Amino acid sequence: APLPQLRAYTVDASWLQPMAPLQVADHTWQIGTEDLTALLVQTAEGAVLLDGGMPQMAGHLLDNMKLRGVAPQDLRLILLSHAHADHAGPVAELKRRTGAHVAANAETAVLLARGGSNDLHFGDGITYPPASADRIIMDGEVVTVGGIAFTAHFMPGHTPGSTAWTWTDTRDGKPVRIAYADSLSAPGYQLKGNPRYPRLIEDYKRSFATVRALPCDLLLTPHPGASNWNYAVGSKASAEALTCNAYADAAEKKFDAQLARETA
Amino acid sequence: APLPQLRAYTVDASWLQPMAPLQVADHTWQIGTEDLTALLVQTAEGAVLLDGGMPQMAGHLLDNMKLRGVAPQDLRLILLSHAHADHAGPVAELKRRTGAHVAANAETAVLLARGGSNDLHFGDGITYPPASADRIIMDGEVVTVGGIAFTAHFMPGHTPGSTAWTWTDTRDGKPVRIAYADSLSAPGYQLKGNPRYPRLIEDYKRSFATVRALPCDLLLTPHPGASNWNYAVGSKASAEALTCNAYADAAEKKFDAQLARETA
Amino acid sequence: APLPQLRAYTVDASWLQPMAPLQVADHTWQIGTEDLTALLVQTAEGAVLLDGGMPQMAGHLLDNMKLRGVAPQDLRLILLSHAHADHAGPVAELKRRTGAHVAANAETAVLLARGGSNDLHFGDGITYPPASADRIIMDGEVVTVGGIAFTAHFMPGHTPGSTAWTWTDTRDGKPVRIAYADSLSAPGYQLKGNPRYPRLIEDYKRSFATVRALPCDLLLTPHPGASNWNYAVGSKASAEALTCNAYADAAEKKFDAQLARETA
Amino acid sequence: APLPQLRAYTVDASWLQPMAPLQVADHTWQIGTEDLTALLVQTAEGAVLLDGGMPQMAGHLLDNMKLRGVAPQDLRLILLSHAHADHAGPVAELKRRTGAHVAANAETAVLLARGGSNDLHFGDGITYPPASADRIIMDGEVVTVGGIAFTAHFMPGHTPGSTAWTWTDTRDGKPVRIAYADSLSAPGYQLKGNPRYPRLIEDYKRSFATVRALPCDLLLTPHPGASNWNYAVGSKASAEALTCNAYADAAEKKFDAQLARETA
Numbered sequence A, B, C, D: 001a002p003l004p005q006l007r008a009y010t011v012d013a014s015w016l017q018p019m020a021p022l023q024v025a026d027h028t029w030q031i032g033t034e035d036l037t038a039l040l041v042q043t044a045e046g047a048v049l050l051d052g053g054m055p056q057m058a059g060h061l062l063d064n065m066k067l068r069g070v071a072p073q074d075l076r077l078i079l080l081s082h083a084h085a086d087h088a089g090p091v092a093e094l095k096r097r098t099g100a101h102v103a104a105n106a107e108t109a110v111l112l113a114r115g116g117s118n119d120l121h122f123g124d125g126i127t128y129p130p131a132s133a134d135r136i137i138m139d140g141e142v143v144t145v146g147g148i149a150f151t152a153h154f155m156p157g158h159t160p161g162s163t164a165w166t167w168t169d170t171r172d173g174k175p176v177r178i179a180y181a182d183s184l185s186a187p188g189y190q191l192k193g194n195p196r197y198p199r200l201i202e203d204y205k206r207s208f209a210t211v212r213a214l215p216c217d218l219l220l221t222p223h224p225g226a227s228n229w230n231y232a233v234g235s236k237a238s239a240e241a242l243t244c245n246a247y248a249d250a251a252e253k254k255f256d257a258q259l260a261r262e263t264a
């Protein structure tokens, strides 16, 4: 009766379905897969990547960047929603091959520094190659790259270092306010009385309020289905998208229903 | 006209005035200096150290531990109020010579991991030897060592990872509630509109409320004068001590007066 | 045509076949599996663990330590042959649950710090949870725990930080010289002209000489079959064991034959 | 009788005497001070910095880079001779302000990661702000930036991670072979029987041989006086420079004389 074999982190095939760059605004592009968001922001002094997807998407991300005429040495900064394997996967590899820097909060940095191991909820089930954060950022801090300002809004819950990012792009000269909000889901989390996360419910609730007040004309999420995006239909991909008010309100209903039946 | 020489971190002589162990409760001992708190908690399965003082206090701390009959290999865990050079100084050296582990929150851990460099307010002026946190702890988490439970209460302000520690000791069988609260001071901090700490005032204000609600019969602070302790007078050292309500209220008045004249 | 799924590191079932502690000398015990070595050395002031095996062996190792009456807080130090997933697997978990310290050379430490990712030969195929080395040790340095002295002998090759450990135990008062030598194999390695390891052949050759001159009356290896141990047969497990001279000489023949046909 | 105050690392004033860029070859420039070498190599795809000097030279280095028309975001890579405070001082600050990457061997990386603390010979006397290495390089590995190839040659001694760097520049179309060799000095080191560095003498001796065989038409050292450079006299600065054979031979004589009188 030998000990069990290691099991790999296997996801849906749509999460790994490569797609060509889809334009969101004048400078923002979706370069991930059909069901996993990876945002590229092209500026005058370099490019910014927000999330990367699964660990095996590093090559694909570099291909799409090459399609936009962004050389590896042109990727200046990597930003994260939260340091889980399905969003921060290729960060370590992308750092070795692009010469980019990684800005994250303290909670995301320590999790990224241990490759997602010892997760508060998942343990060691979803390990990815570890990467080191180069710059610790605080709640409400401003990151500027080539004239575009990225504001961090801490929204703890899914992970302690969950972050929503907001910046103002243009839609052919028309200023658009874009908010990239993190996941508000608690898949399988023990919500009440979790010894690894005592103030979990208080963090989630305040985070629901933080997403509602985001300056946002167009919302995006690490999973496009969470904000009702559909990357397949190209031009019509943002048609049935959700506001921030709808996003936080629908996520809270699921949280409360889950919180209620957890007591049963 | 050469570039200026490096300058060392020099403190008051009372901060480095060694003192014999002073008993606080049945298991809690003060083993630091006259004006710098270093708390030793002796249990059945090992000892816990809360803060260490200046970097040059490592030898003195080990001497006082030897006086209490605590061998180096008996120090099991090191806890921190905040990872500044005058409180977390000897941590790196104490880890090499005691085989102890260090529990800290994410914000304190990243600061401890870079030896206090790149401080949000002090820059590189107060560098100390870096040490690595072994266990990341969350707000309200419980650390237990030999039957004594240590609860963490996040109180950001002085540093982003400022933590107050509470535990229940005895005073000859009589249960006493001890709270070791961090500094609530902002010495020279730019409070309003600090780009390195945008939500600084909101963190301080909520932290004033957090210290008021601490379960506490006897309060201690990293600087004994802040809670009106006087380690010199031995038995009478806790006579004119302050409550948590008085501590947070007096610190807030100074904060507001400082906040008010900062606008001038 | 989606991107391929992650694959887990799967090994032979004998590598994960738990076994009861098998005594090697008066203080040295084998507490790993049938085909994976994990050595426990019990002293007067604590215990030392050499290697741990696969990542999923942490619980089993703690059980065997409990069988020898070694509490988790009695494990003082963890030593490594090399920081590959099949030998340094449970180190990160064993540190969280035993309060132990990890001594390794610089090369092993950086590899352990990135969880075996970005391997010089294996890439990211064999990732394990990352752990941090607490004490950097040099070639020929002495580690002492409870009167037993452990000498490190650098033997680069399999990994840049490969280390053989030697110490003198007793066999009922009779002093025995034990050498725990690392693997001398290069499974699938590109030997000549490897850009990630330019001086690879020079390191291997000098390492063959280093193992020959080890003070050794009884040799052990991370894979028991490499030194012709057979952990199943209990008392007869060390019968057909190899000397250090035979071990290094047989490994060199395979290296040269592999080096010769690599040119073809 | 209080404990002593911390003391700062104070050097000679010539070590901090800023100087304008002095041209060494078509692409190599000296941008440090009069008695501390900091080499800038300008290529088609970016710039490379070799060493930085004292920690307070970060601003000066960026000024000289601005004089050569090298923006901060144009510094792609930082290379180190050894991670002591007087050569690797501004690395941490230069990483935050240039978006550059740091390549170092394992031994230099761990020392750089702890800010030079716990030195094998100096203890905590010469602490500098810690920085993290982004890419671990092996002995003889090739680093290429914009068509210029940098070869690492490990030469342990002064520190375990001491590295000499060689590359081929031009002197108006004429190919020149430049070797930047590390210090071969052991100032105050205990050479024979040092428990922190057991094989110290063997490392130094083999390192004397490694510097002799360096492909070198023009040698430079972290301290210009060690190779008989004189940065003050501008055009005549490389007049009385030493070969590699002379450099290693003169350093060995001092080592042996020091080794001989250490036995007395």
Ligand SMILES: CO[C@@]1(NC(=O)[C@@H](C)C(=O)O)C(=O)N2C(C(=O)O)=C(C)CO[C@@H]21
Pocket: A011, A084, A085, A086, A122, A126, A158, A183, A184, A185, A187, A188, A223
């Ligand atoms: C770690 O990755 C996730 N979880 C899993 O893949 C497994 C472990 C599972 O929960 O079944 C996780 O969190 N995600 C999110 C998210 O909203 O972030 C959603 C929607 C669910 O999928 C990924």
Ligand SMILES: CO[C@@]1(NC(=O)[C@@H](C)C(=O)O)C(=O)N2C(C(=O)O)=C(C)CO[C@@H]21
Pocket: B011, B084, B085, B086, B122, B126, B158, B183, B184, B185, B187, B188, B223
């Ligand atoms: C970094 O150490 C401190 N600051 C200094 O020593 C210098 C830099 C200074 O501010 O003049 C700091 O913070 N302390 C506290 C505290 O309450 O924590 C008090 C009361 C003031 O002294 C120390």
Ligand SMILES: CO[C@@]1(NC(=O)[C@@H](C)C(=O)O)C(=O)N2C(C(=O)O)=C(C)CO[C@@H]21
Pocket: C011, C084, C085, C086, C122, C126, C158, C183, C184, C185, C187, C188, C223
């Ligand atoms: C990373 O673990 C090893 N390699 C593998 O499991 C796969 C990747 C494989 O090479 O097929 C590795 O090295 N080992 C050794 C050793 O001597 O250390 C031997 C004998 C072969 O197995 C393990």
Ligand SMILES: CO[C@@]1(NC(=O)[C@@H](C)C(=O)O)C(=O)N2C(C(=O)O)=C(C)CO[C@@H]21
Pocket: D011, D084, D085, D086, D122, D126, D158, D183, D184, D185, D187, D188, D223
């Ligand atoms: C750590 O910096 C050094 N040492 C000191 O500054 C003090 C501590 C001292 O030894 O008196 C050190 O090593 N250097 C070298 C070198 O060759 O690298 C030389 C020539 C001497 O100066 C610097």
Ligand SMILES: [Zn+2]
Pocket: A082, A084, A086, A158, A183
């Ligand atoms: Zn997730």
Ligand SMILES: [Zn+2]
Pocket: A084, A086, A087, A183, A222, A223
């Ligand atoms: Zn997800």
Ligand SMILES: [Zn+2]
Pocket: B082, B084, B086, B158, B183
């Ligand atoms: Zn402080």
Ligand SMILES: [Zn+2]
Pocket: B084, B086, B087, B183, B222, B223
């Ligand atoms: Zn203080």
Ligand SMILES: [Zn+2]
Pocket: C082, C084, C086, C158, C183
């Ligand atoms: Zn291996």
Ligand SMILES: [Zn+2]
Pocket: C084, C086, C087, C183, C222, C223
């Ligand atoms: Zn193996």
Ligand SMILES: [Zn+2]
Pocket: D082, D084, D086, D158, D183
């Ligand atoms: Zn030096």
Ligand SMILES: [Zn+2]
Pocket: D084, D086, D087, D183, D222, D223
């Ligand atoms: Zn020097």
